[PDB]
Structure formats: C-alpha cells, structure tokens
Amino acid sequence: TILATAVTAVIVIALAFYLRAKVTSTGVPSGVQLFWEALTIQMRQQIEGSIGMKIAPFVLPLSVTIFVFILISNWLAVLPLQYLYKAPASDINFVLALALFVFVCYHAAGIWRRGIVGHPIKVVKGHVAFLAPINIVEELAKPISLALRLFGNIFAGGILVALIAMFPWYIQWFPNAVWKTFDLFVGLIQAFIFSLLTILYFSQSME
Amino acid sequence: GGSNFLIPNGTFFAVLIIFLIVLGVISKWVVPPISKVLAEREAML
Amino acid sequence: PNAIITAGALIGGGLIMGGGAIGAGIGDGIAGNALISGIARQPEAQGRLFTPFFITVGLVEAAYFINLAFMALFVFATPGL
Amino acid sequence: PNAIITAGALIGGGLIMGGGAIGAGIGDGIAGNALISGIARQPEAQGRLFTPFFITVGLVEAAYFINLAFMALFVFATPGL
Amino acid sequence: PNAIITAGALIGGGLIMGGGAIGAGIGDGIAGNALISGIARQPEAQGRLFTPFFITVGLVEAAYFINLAFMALFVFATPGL
Amino acid sequence: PNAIITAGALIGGGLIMGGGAIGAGIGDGIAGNALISGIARQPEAQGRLFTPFFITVGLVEAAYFINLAFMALFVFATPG
Amino acid sequence: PNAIITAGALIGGGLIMGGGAIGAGIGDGIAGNALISGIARQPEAQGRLFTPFFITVGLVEAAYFINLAFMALFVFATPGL
Amino acid sequence: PNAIITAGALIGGGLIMGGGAIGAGIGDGIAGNALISGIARQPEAQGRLFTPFFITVGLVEAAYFINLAFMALFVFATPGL
Amino acid sequence: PNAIITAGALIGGGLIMGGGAIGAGIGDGIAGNALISGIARQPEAQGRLFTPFFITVGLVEAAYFINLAFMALFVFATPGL
Amino acid sequence: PNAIITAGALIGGGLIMGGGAIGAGIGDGIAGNALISGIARQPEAQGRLFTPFFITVGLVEAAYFINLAFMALFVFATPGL
Amino acid sequence: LDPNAIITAGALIGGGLIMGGGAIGAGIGDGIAGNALISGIARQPEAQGRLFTPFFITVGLVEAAYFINLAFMALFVFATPGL
Amino acid sequence: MSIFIGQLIGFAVIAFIIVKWVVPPVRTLMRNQQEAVRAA
C-alpha cells in the first residue's frame, strides 16, 4: 500500500533532477521544462489573481506538488498490472495525508496572519452572523470535501476495474479500455480541482 | 470478508513523510530555476 | 439474522446509488446546458469555457462517486453482522 | 434466509435503475434544450454544438451505465447471499 | 419462498418504471419546450429543428425503453426462484 | 402466501402510476410554459405552434399511458 | 391475510396520490409562471393567454383526477383480495 | 390485524401529504418568481399581476388541500378494517 | 401490537415533514432568485419587491408549518393505539 | 417489540434528513445562481447583493435546522416507545 | 429474530436515505451554480476572478449541508442511536 | 490468465487511441511553444 506511493515519489524526483540539469534560458524549451513550467505558470497566475504573490508566496510549490503527486499516481494505474499496482489514493491514508496537511497549513497561515485569538473568531463569525453556526461547521467540512472527493473518485474506479474482471477476456477488453480512458481524464480533472481548491482555501484564509 | 476500509492504518505517516520530502525537493529544484527562467523569458519579451 | 441485515444493506446501497445518479445526471446536464449555450453565443469562447465546465464536473462527479464508495462500503463490508 | 436477501437485492436494483433513469433522462433533456436553442439561434452552429453535446451526454450516460452495471451486480451476482 | 421474492420483484420493477417515466416525461417535455420556443422565435425553422429534437427524444426514449426492458426482466423472469 | 405477492403488486402499481403522473404533469406543464410564451411574443403563431405542443405532449402522454397499462398488468393480472 | 393486501393497497394508493399531487402542483405553478411573465410585459394579453394556460391546466388536472380515480380503485375497490 | 392496516394507513397518509407539500411549495415558489420578476420589469403592475398569481396559487393550494383531505380520510377514518 | 402502529406512524411523520422540507427549501430559493435578480436590476427592488417576496415566502412557510403540525399529530397522538 | 419502534424511528428520521438535504442544497444553489449572474452582469452590486442572498439562504437553512432538530428528537428520544 | 438485527437493518436503510438525499441536493446545487458560473464567464470573459468568490461561497454552503447529512449518516450506521 | 490478456488488449486499444488522437495535438502544442520561443 506504500510502495505504490513510493514509486510515484521516485518518479517525480527523477523528473525534477532531469529538469534541474536540463533547464536553460539560452536554448529551447523542448525538454520536460514545458510541463513543470506549464503547471507553474497556471498556478502562479491563479494565486496572483486570488491572493497575490507577495502576500502568500510559499503556496506555489505546494500547489504544484499536490497536483503532480496526484496526477502521476492516478495515471500510472492505467498500466496493465491488473494480474500488482493500485492507485494509492484508493486508500484513505493517502487522501488524509494530503488533505489534513493542507488543512493544518492553511489554518496555521490564518493564525500567523490574524493571530491565535482573532482568527478563530473570524472563522466562527463568517460572512454572516446567523451563518456563523454553519460557518463553524463549514470550517471542518472544507477538508473532508477535499479528502472524500479524491477517495470516492479513485475508489469507484478501483472497484469497477475489479468488477469488470468477472467477464471473460474477449468481452472484457472493451469495458476495461473504456473505463481507463475515462479515468485518465477524470483523474486529471480531480487533481487540478484539488490544487485549485487548495489555492482558494488559502485565499479565503490569508485575507 | 470485508475489512471496513474507511478506518486509517499505520501507512498514513509513511505516505505523509514521502509526500513531505517530495515537496521539499520540488520547492528547491523545480521552482527556483523555473521562476528565474520565466522571469528572464518575460524580459526577452 | 445476518440475512435481514444483508437485505437492509443492499437496499441502503441502492438508495445511495440512486440518489447519486439522480444528482450526477441532473447536474452534468445543467452544466452542459450552460456550456452549450455559451458556445452557441460566443463561438471563440469554447476554449476558455471548457475549464469552468470541468471544474463543475469535478464537483458533481465527486458528489456522485462519494456515494458510490459508501455504497461499496454498505454492500461489501456491511457493519453490524 | 437467502430468499430475503434476494428480495432485498431486487429492490435495491430497482431503486438504482430508477434513480439512474431519472438522472439520465432529465440531463439528456436539458442538454437537448440547450442544443435546440442554439441550433435555432445559429443554423450554422450545428457542427460546433454537436461536440459539447456529446461530451455532456457522455458524462450523463456514463453515470447511467455505471448505475446499470452495479444493478446487474446486485441482481445476478448479489454481493452477499 | 417464491412469494417473497416475487413481491420484491414487483416492487423493483415498479421502481424501475416509475423512475423511467419521471425521467422521460420531464426530459421530453423540456425538449418540447425548447422546440416550441425556437419555432416561435423563427416561424420558418421547423424543418431543421425537428431533427435534433428527434435526437434528444431518441436518447430519452432509449433510456426509458432500457428501463422498461429491465422491468420486464425483473417481473416475468425473476432470478433466484 | 399469494397475499404477499398481491400486496407487493399493489405497491408496485402505485409506484408506477405515481412516477408516471409526476413525469406527465411536469412535462405537460413545461410544454404549456413554452406555448404560453411563444403565443405571447408571436401573437399569431398559434396556428403553427399548437402542432408541436400536441406532439411533445403526446410523446409525454405516451410514457404516462404506457406506465398506466403496465400498472394495470401488475395489479389486475399479477404474476404468481 | 386480506389485511396484508389491504395495507399494501393503502400504501400504493398513497404513492399514486402523492406523485399525482407533486406533478399537478409543479405543472400548474410553471404554467402560472409563464402566464404572469406573459401578462407582465404585454399587459393586455390576458384574454389571449387565458386559452393556452387553461389547456395546459386541463392537461395536468386530467392526470391528477385520473390518479385519484386509480387510488380509489386500489383502496376502495381493491384488486384481488 | 387492526395494527397492520393502521400502520399501512399512516404510511400512506404521510406519502400523500408529503407529495402534496412538495408540489405546493415548489409551485408557490415558481409562481412567486414570476410575480417578483414581472413586478421588477414594470413596477406599477402590482395588483394587475396579483390576479393571475392568485389564480395559480389557487390551483396549487387546491391540489394541496385535496391531498390534505385524503390524508385525513386515510388516518382518521381508515378504509377497510 | 401497538409497536407496529408506532413504527408506521414515525415513518409517516418522517415522510410528511421531509416532503415539506423539500418544498420549503426549494420554494424559498426560487423566490430569492427573483428577488436577487430584481435587486440587481434596480435599487427600487429592495423597497418594493419585499411585499411580493413576503407574500410568496408566506404561501410556502404556511405549508411547511402546517405539515410540521400534522407530523406532530401523527407521532405524538397516533390514532389507532 | 421496542426494536421495531426503534427501526421505524431510524427510518423516519432518515427520510426527514434526506428531504431536508435535498431542499437545502437545491434552494441554496438556486439562490447562488442569481448571485453569480448578478455579479457577472453588475460588478459593483456585490455590497447590496449579499444581504438578500444571506436572507434567502437563512430561510432555507432555518427549514433545514428545524428538520434536523426533529430528526434528532425522533432518533434519540423515540416519542412513543 | 435478534433485536440488534432489526435495529441495524433500519439503521442502514436510514443512512442510505440520508446519504441519497444529500447526494441529490449536492449534485443539483453544484450543477446550478456551475451553470451560473459558466454563463457568466461566457458573457464576461475577464470576470473569472470576481465570479470565483460567490461560486465557492455557495458551493461551500451546499457541501456543508451535504457533509452534515453525511456525518449523521455515519452516526446512524456506526453507532445505531437508541439500540 | 484470462483477466490479464483481456485487460492487456484493453491497454493496447487505449494506447493506440492515445497514440493517434492525443499525441499529435499535444506534440503540436509543444512544437508551437518551441517555435514561439524562437520567435525573437
């Protein structure tokens, strides 16, 4: 259950070493730098639009890592290891490891920003006085909304792929292919939306 | 049969650790060079 | 005794998946209606519109698949046995 | 004991297909409403519009056929029995 | 034993047909609303608008008749008996 | 025993007709909405416009009366 | 034994009446929405638009009273028994 | 015996009144939406629009009150028995 | 015996107040949508449209509270005991 | 015996919370659509726009809280055991 | 029959009802908000940054209702109140 | 193993699908960005 994540880790590490050695401003962008850079530009632009860079500079690397670490782990599961691999996000542990860390980080930011005494009050009061009772619950619903989202979206696939296995091979080749084709795009979407939601939670926490 | 898959196991801390080291490695090697490169590329424009 | 609990679990999973499918279908259709109207109004807006569409889809499909996973929990690992 | 489980499973499958049919029908109807509005707005736009229509219908029909697969699972291959 | 299973089966098939009818009625009515509004917007538009209305109608009626066939499968030819 | 089947049959027929009525009522209402609006902004279109309305309303009523017939099948001539 | 059948009959009658009432309420409301919206922007239209609104209201009310009659069938003149 | 019929009756009455309330609320809201929007488009039209609004509200409340009376008949004066 | 009656009564109370809650929520939202749009079109709306909005919210909440009262009547004064 | 009352109570409370959830979500979304559209077509309006939106959301959430409170009463107190 | 059996069956059915209604409301609300957002970004291209705020506020409210229903569902299924 | 051969053929068909449809557009976009870079 861990090795499936460690593989994605070593993959992204090697990719970062490749970029480090290759990247140049003198020459062409043909190398991998077009992926790392195509992610960095979108994340930079989103955070600059929402919160502005200098108010919250450190959230860019966090966003790009919580994007790639999810994207690679979702896509690599498409390979025909059906038999040993399994999408690590199919286990609650991975989803919590991401979501509760994002939670503690943005709340620590709220504390550093507004202070330990004032930030709780700002979280409880919310945008409306009578909304405050529901605001104190939304404050905890947000991270569950980050976690269960990934968990369900990848576990439905981890289940359907094992369900389709009860057909014979000749019948089986069609639905497995259709589902994995669907899952590539849907996993990309659910990683992008996780990174965007992280950026937005920070946006409404730093203010 | 059935394992009540909702309840977390010990693997949680390990996945967190192997995410954290990835985050640090990225923040160092991916982002500084690329931001420098993107800034210079904008100066080229 | 395990039998009545198993039947209840199956029925509960059915309710879960039915509600999930109702919501997923209706929401996906509405988001698509917005996208189609926009692409009919502003032909060159197709590209810029595709992104908010996939964000809304990532919200609704999640609302669906969370229930789907809880259905898997009810049926395959039924509590209380 | 098994008979009760089978009856529960049939009820669950019925609920699943009912909810799925509701969602799929309503979503396809709303997407069609958008498509007709657009094809009335711009007779040239049919080629443009067929694309996001197939995308939305693919999403809705995917939800429906997922419900259908789980229904077949409940009925013919009951998770417990 | 057959009695309980067939009772559950009738309930299931009824849920299938009920959800199917809800979805078909609402979706096809919405498509007709789009068609009527478009034909009022353009009094010479009927000839072309009939085609995509038949397309959306085909999708919704396909869902309805799939549900109907599975209802027939639940009621007359129940598994488990 | 057969009584159990009978009760299930009455429940199923009721579900069928309830869903059919929901769908048919809402669809006919939406069609009437479109008709009222088109007749409002095209004061004379009514002659051409009633035909699509009867057509879509008929396509809805088809689902309704199909559900009704199958309900009669469930209830009056229940299997068992 | 008759008692079980009669209880099922009351439950089914409730289901049919509830669905009919939902449909009739929502349909009459949306027709009234179209009517108010039409009479607002064309104040004198009332004596024109009264016609199609009553046609729609009759179409829905027919289904409501039909469902009422069939619930009377299940309850008072119970099938079988 | 009486217990079973009474329980079925209470469940049926609840179904009746719940469906009636759903339809009534949704229709009242759909009507009020047109009322408010028409009163926003042409301010001076208060009572002129009120009249069609009272008509629509009358239709929907009539459905609701009929369902209420049937629920009362089910509960207080249980058929059969 | 009385236990079965009480179970049916509680299920019926849940059905009634659940339907009432659905209707109240959806109706209040649909009204507020017209209110918000009208206030976006004209500052005079915040002054004027409140009479219609209170009227509509009243027609909805009357149904909610009356269904709530009948729920209390089923569950706390269960006829049949 | 008490077990049957308890099961009925759980089922009723669940119906209660499900209806409340449907209503709250749909009404809140319908209000949000008007808010988003107003912020799209009238950027400077946000200040006056937020109050009516919170008012509508407040009505919906009040219905939801009442529904939840009665569900809690049902499930934890079992009024009739 | 054992009493725990009936109670657990009712509990699972209730939890199913709760989670189903929650999922319906959440899906439909999210869809309507997304429709508003998409149409607004279609008519006002630069508005994305202004529009994202109220969209996420409404989505937060909707999701909070959904997950409140989910929490009570978890209570029903895993604790069986009143057993 | 029947499961393995079936899901392998599924992987092959999806690989062919990506190779024809997904690959040329993404490579076209990357080429467009390279040429744009050169543009100065």
mmCIF file of C-alpha atoms in Angstrom, chain C residues 2-4 6-15 17-26 28-37 39-43 46 50 53-54 57 61 64-65 68 71 75-76, chain D residues 1-2 4-5 8-9 11-13 15-16 18-20 22-24 26-28 30-31 33-35 38 41-42 45 48-49 51-53 55-56 59-60 62-64 66-67 70 73-74 78-81:
data_model
loop_
_atom_site.group_PDB
_atom_site.id
_atom_site.type_symbol
_atom_site.label_atom_id
_atom_site.label_comp_id
_atom_site.label_asym_id
_atom_site.label_seq_id
_atom_site.Cartn_x
_atom_site.Cartn_y
_atom_site.Cartn_z
ATOM 1 C CA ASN C 2 -27.413 -11.794 9.251
ATOM 2 C CA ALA C 3 -29.938 -12.106 6.428
ATOM 3 C CA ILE C 4 -32.167 -9.182 7.344
ATOM 4 C CA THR C 6 -27.776 -8.023 4.476
ATOM 5 C CA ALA C 7 -31.062 -7.154 2.808
ATOM 6 C CA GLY C 8 -31.104 -3.806 4.563
ATOM 7 C CA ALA C 9 -27.563 -3.139 3.417
ATOM 8 C CA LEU C 10 -28.444 -3.907 -0.189
ATOM 9 C CA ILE C 11 -31.476 -1.620 -0.056
ATOM 10 C CA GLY C 12 -29.431 1.163 1.502
ATOM 11 C CA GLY C 13 -26.760 0.879 -1.153
ATOM 12 C CA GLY C 14 -29.470 1.075 -3.765
ATOM 13 C CA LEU C 15 -30.875 4.264 -2.275
ATOM 14 C CA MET C 17 -26.560 4.984 -5.747
ATOM 15 C CA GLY C 18 -29.979 6.101 -6.950
ATOM 16 C CA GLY C 19 -29.682 9.493 -5.311
ATOM 17 C CA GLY C 20 -26.133 9.820 -6.559
ATOM 18 C CA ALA C 21 -27.175 9.079 -10.123
ATOM 19 C CA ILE C 22 -30.108 11.487 -9.983
ATOM 20 C CA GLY C 23 -27.836 14.272 -8.826
ATOM 21 C CA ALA C 24 -24.992 13.442 -11.194
ATOM 22 C CA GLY C 25 -27.217 13.277 -14.245
ATOM 23 C CA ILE C 26 -29.120 16.463 -13.497
ATOM 24 C CA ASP C 28 -23.965 17.282 -15.503
ATOM 25 C CA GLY C 29 -26.845 18.106 -17.815
ATOM 26 C CA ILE C 30 -27.224 21.602 -16.395
ATOM 27 C CA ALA C 31 -23.503 22.338 -16.630
ATOM 28 C CA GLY C 32 -23.545 21.075 -20.198
ATOM 29 C CA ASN C 33 -26.521 23.303 -20.930
ATOM 30 C CA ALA C 34 -24.512 26.282 -19.755
ATOM 31 C CA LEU C 35 -21.527 25.251 -21.868
ATOM 32 C CA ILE C 36 -23.624 24.659 -24.975
ATOM 33 C CA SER C 37 -25.401 27.988 -24.608
ATOM 34 C CA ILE C 39 -20.568 28.030 -27.207
ATOM 35 C CA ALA C 40 -23.651 28.980 -29.196
ATOM 36 C CA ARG C 41 -23.397 32.614 -28.111
ATOM 37 C CA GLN C 42 -19.591 33.102 -28.222
ATOM 38 C CA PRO C 43 -18.042 30.634 -30.688
ATOM 39 C CA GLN C 46 -15.162 27.383 -26.361
ATOM 40 C CA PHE C 50 -14.064 24.259 -21.143
ATOM 41 C CA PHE C 53 -17.068 23.237 -17.141
ATOM 42 C CA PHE C 54 -14.582 20.616 -15.998
ATOM 43 C CA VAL C 57 -17.989 18.421 -13.461
ATOM 44 C CA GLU C 61 -18.938 13.705 -10.314
ATOM 45 C CA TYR C 64 -21.659 11.050 -7.133
ATOM 46 C CA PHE C 65 -18.583 8.920 -6.524
ATOM 47 C CA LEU C 68 -20.713 5.203 -4.839
ATOM 48 C CA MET C 71 -22.381 2.042 -1.374
ATOM 49 C CA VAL C 75 -22.675 -3.801 0.455
ATOM 50 C CA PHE C 76 -19.204 -5.375 0.620
ATOM 51 C CA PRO D 1 -32.666 -16.787 4.645
ATOM 52 C CA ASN D 2 -31.326 -16.437 1.117
ATOM 53 C CA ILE D 4 -34.973 -12.405 1.881
ATOM 54 C CA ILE D 5 -31.556 -11.396 0.587
ATOM 55 C CA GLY D 8 -33.757 -7.047 -0.925
ATOM 56 C CA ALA D 9 -31.338 -7.218 -3.831
ATOM 57 C CA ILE D 11 -35.488 -3.880 -4.517
ATOM 58 C CA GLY D 12 -32.052 -2.289 -4.429
ATOM 59 C CA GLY D 13 -31.505 -2.830 -8.133
ATOM 60 C CA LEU D 15 -34.043 1.779 -6.817
ATOM 61 C CA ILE D 16 -30.709 2.067 -8.613
ATOM 62 C CA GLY D 18 -34.992 4.231 -11.159
ATOM 63 C CA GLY D 19 -32.689 6.951 -9.908
ATOM 64 C CA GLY D 20 -30.343 6.447 -12.830
ATOM 65 C CA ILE D 22 -34.407 9.908 -13.709
ATOM 66 C CA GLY D 23 -30.977 11.488 -13.861
ATOM 67 C CA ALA D 24 -30.134 10.370 -17.384
ATOM 68 C CA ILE D 26 -33.507 14.811 -17.248
ATOM 69 C CA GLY D 27 -29.893 15.561 -18.116
ATOM 70 C CA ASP D 28 -30.278 14.486 -21.724
ATOM 71 C CA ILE D 30 -31.737 19.683 -20.634
ATOM 72 C CA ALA D 31 -28.726 19.254 -22.910
ATOM 73 C CA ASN D 33 -32.909 22.013 -24.755
ATOM 74 C CA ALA D 34 -29.617 23.849 -24.990
ATOM 75 C CA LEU D 35 -28.837 22.234 -28.340
ATOM 76 C CA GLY D 38 -28.515 27.028 -30.134
ATOM 77 C CA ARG D 41 -30.059 30.699 -32.737
ATOM 78 C CA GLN D 42 -27.364 29.785 -35.287
ATOM 79 C CA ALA D 45 -23.618 26.241 -35.421
ATOM 80 C CA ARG D 48 -19.862 23.302 -33.432
ATOM 81 C CA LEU D 49 -22.572 22.329 -30.964
ATOM 82 C CA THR D 51 -19.313 18.351 -29.748
ATOM 83 C CA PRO D 52 -20.142 19.670 -26.248
ATOM 84 C CA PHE D 53 -23.492 17.927 -26.567
ATOM 85 C CA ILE D 55 -19.485 15.497 -24.109
ATOM 86 C CA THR D 56 -22.338 16.231 -21.702
ATOM 87 C CA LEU D 59 -20.995 12.196 -18.842
ATOM 88 C CA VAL D 60 -24.695 11.606 -18.168
ATOM 89 C CA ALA D 62 -21.601 7.240 -18.073
ATOM 90 C CA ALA D 63 -23.390 7.829 -14.790
ATOM 91 C CA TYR D 64 -26.384 5.870 -16.089
ATOM 92 C CA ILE D 66 -22.392 2.808 -14.124
ATOM 93 C CA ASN D 67 -25.664 2.512 -12.227
ATOM 94 C CA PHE D 70 -23.990 -2.022 -10.347
ATOM 95 C CA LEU D 73 -24.171 -6.835 -9.928
ATOM 96 C CA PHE D 74 -26.853 -6.564 -7.250
ATOM 97 C CA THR D 78 -25.595 -10.475 -5.149
ATOM 98 C CA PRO D 79 -22.708 -9.102 -3.010
ATOM 99 C CA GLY D 80 -23.863 -11.450 -0.277
ATOM 100 C CA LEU D 81 -26.090 -14.485 -0.230
#
